[PDB]
Amino acid sequence: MDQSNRYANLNLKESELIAGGRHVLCAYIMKPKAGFGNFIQTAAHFVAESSTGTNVEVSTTDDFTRGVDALVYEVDEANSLMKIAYPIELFDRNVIDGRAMIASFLTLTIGNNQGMGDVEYAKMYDFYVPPAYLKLFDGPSTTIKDLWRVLGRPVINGGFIVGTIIKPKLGLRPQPFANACYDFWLGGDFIKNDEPQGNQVFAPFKDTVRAVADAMRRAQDKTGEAKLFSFNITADDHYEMLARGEFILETFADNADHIAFLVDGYVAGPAAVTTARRAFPKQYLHYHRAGHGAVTSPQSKRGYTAFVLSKMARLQGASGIHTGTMGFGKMEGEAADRAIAYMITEDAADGPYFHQEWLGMNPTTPIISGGMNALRMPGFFDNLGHSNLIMTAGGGAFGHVDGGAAGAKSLRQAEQCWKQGADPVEFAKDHREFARAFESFPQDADKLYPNWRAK
Amino acid sequence: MDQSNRYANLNLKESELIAGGRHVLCAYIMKPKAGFGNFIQTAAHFVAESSTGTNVEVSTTDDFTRGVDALVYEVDEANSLMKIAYPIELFDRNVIDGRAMIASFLTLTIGNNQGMGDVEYAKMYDFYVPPAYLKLFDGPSTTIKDLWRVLGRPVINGGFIVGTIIKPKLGLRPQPFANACYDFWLGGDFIKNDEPQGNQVFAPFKDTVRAVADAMRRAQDKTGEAKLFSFNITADDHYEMLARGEFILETFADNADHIAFLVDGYVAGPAAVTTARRAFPKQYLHYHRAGHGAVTSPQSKRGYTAFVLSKMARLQGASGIHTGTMGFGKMEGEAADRAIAYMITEDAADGPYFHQEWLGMNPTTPIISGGMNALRMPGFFDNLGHSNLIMTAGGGAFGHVDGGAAGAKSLRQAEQCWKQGADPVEFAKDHREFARAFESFPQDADKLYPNWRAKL
Amino acid sequence: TTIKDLWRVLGRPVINGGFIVGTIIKPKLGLRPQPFANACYDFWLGGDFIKNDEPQGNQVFAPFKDTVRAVADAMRRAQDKTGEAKLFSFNITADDHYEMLARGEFILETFADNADHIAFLVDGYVAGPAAVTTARRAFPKQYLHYHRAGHGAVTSPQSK
């Protein structure tokens, strides 16, 4: 069925839809499946299944319904491009506080339309949210600013936070776990649970949390510097999340503001993210995106990009989200991913298709992680342009030949090298921990610094 | 780095791993990315990133850690197949009640491994959960049996529940919405919110719920039959979900057990599903899977299949989940998808790779939806083999030339046609609403029943 | 929450968004729900912001829920008439923590899509820090309006 006359209006001007401030805009790369309708016919059906319609005519439709129809307003078949305008009235709102929910945005813009038989594939690359809709989202309540304050750093451009992940990913018992925490903290700032760590039978939650709390006190007493930990509180059950968060804060007591809460936001879902954001607004919300690659990978032509994921996370209220290593680590990523960081940190930024004003909504920290080490950092910072961020290196830290403490210091010195604009190999001559990272990861050293051994 | 010596043990026997009952097994179709390690090397790194390891050696690893390593135990590079055994000790448990969480299963089995640079793609096609881990999941608390009971049907094989979705998807104001509900209920059993319907500014939640409650009373008074409604209570905020559910049940009062709760489980996530399952265990939990196609589509070689999604939903405690039309409707699906239905309904069933014993865990209803109408139903039932299910037809009902009530009856008569083993075109001669579905959807009629006009 | 969040609702710049024109509903007490709401509508035709006078709440002649409903209607009518956003600051002060919650929760549900136009007023000096914190922690996304009635007993330069 051809629904183009109803759901397509290519005469609409994007600048006017934006100026109007009554529409969410979404940009897709879509391709019709062979043996069905043409591009505009397919786009029209796509819009219907994403707003007010279905695959056939229904007598129950009235003019009020047609008034809130989503509309395809711009197409470019040669480039498989499709842009759709969603009246903001379509999106669900909370009965309890009249605020927006990302779940509704997802259901409409990237829901049932991902199962359409007449569509080969469709993926969202960008979206625009107008002020009237934007202001209804929670946004971040805690930012990197609050971590800088605890660390005793300037609250403006407080600089690089040296982080790690406790490795093994799973298998460490409570005290061996806490011992590794202490070791790293002698040289580093920040430690996060690896994403699956919680209440395993061999590492009970409360025992581990208590041991880590003791390690933090010991590390802070030894170094005279503040230390941070990000605990995984992810669960299916809302009340389990509350129980974990509540126990952690009571346990850390006077160090409670040194605690971040990690949530596996992609697999547990927006509901889990919001549980943490609304229950613990004064604790840094650390969004871990495990599983995201199933749709965000450039190998996938479905779902949405990492850029879209990141932008949504800022609205949901993540204090920080993993943005990837931008091609410099072990995970899939491109150097161009730097644009993701800018979109979540700045008050105004450009996406692949839409400019976004954030209207003073708090920033979300780009958390850099995935096969990073001291050697790979100078190149990463050069591409990004700043080090006002958290970087976690698990293997990069505990894989250091001289141990976790030395690993931490190598990360510290690596960023110091980049800020000083010094040559890494020349810099290494006066910085042992950094130099020993070459010996720790010789395969990496050979690639990045061909004749590092001679010098 | 080659981690095959640690994370691969192809000498392990699947029958023994299953017999042991200490391992979750997962089957993937994976392809290494060119310019990295071979198949077994790549599978080894995959296993490391999905259990206990990372991409390099760390001094903190001990022999206890190696003991809980996941292991690739079976490979077939020619068919891109990879099977991994996960010690159940790896999976997270609730502090509050010691029960399992699907979030941990996902984090490990299909989490970070979906972003690996040395892997071109990897997708889970099946998984096995042993008794020790299986018994820790909530499972469904309400089933179709509880809907049959309200309808006055037999609680065993109570039969086909005629359903629809209120269309337009969005745009109907509270009373026009309720009017459509009333009309359909004159001929049908079951109505669900279209998945995005909730508290839109033009259709406030409480006003719509009140109007629908009135429509249910009026329809039940008119027909003398019980009517069902499935309300969307999906939200980001746990407390919004509770507020919606609590208001609905108070409003419907003596009809409160006629209410199902719909949750957009894929986009809102397992956390939202569990909110409804644990807060409202005595209300039918209707899992709507909007967005799933982004990974479950056969066009995708990442994530997991719809089979995997459906099996997870039963563990999570869905009373019913959309399983698709199995190729007979408007959404992507194949006739072979019938196996999904069997996996969520039976106490024992076979997946593409693993046999599963459910140990008396309640079944999850196959909810059939997506471009269905009276004409397409006989063929669908032929492929599945039974009609003990809920089928919702939005366009199929309200797109009927004679309206929603006639639409409902055409669906009713279509299943009766299949049950009697009658010829649809011959059956139509004596059943007007069914016959009028041919005129309502002529393109479908021409394809499905050549020369129907001549015979009608 | 800060004035930035009010500026955002008014469509003003979120930095140095400028002057917010406000008033207090007078008589301090004595207006019944609809006469109260009528005064709100009238002011909102030219102004941005209205606060409860500090003692206004659930007086027997002006029941809380009836007044909140009437004011909510006035806000919609005023916003439709002027095409500009309007703000209200409601007194939710009480001895009982749970009364404060009940008032705040009812206001936000009633105002619905205008819920972010709502500020909560707390008579912080007489009800105390405990009352201020109840509102701050229970409703962090709503502008917290600290009314200092009674402060003059110590803050006055006449007092040493």
Ligand SMILES: O=C(O)[C@@](O)(COP(=O)(O)O)[C@H](O)[C@H](O)COP(=O)(O)O
């Ligand atoms: O489990 C892991 O692999 C990590 O702890 C990194 O460990 P290593 O530092 O030892 O490699 C992080 O979770 C990934 O970076 C997640 O990827 P992303 O940030 O792209 O979401």
Ligand SMILES: O=C(O)[C@@](O)(COP(=O)(O)O)[C@H](O)[C@H](O)COP(=O)(O)O
């Ligand atoms: O919005 C829709 O399209 C539907 O209400 C069907 O309406 P129609 O009857 O008018 O087609 C269902 O949500 C889809 O079937 C979901 O797909 P699935 O069941 O595959 O998850």
Ligand SMILES: [Mg+2]
């Ligand atoms: Mg990790």
Ligand SMILES: [Mg+2]
């Ligand atoms: Mg639907």
Ligand SMILES: [Mg+2]
């Ligand atoms: Mg006053």
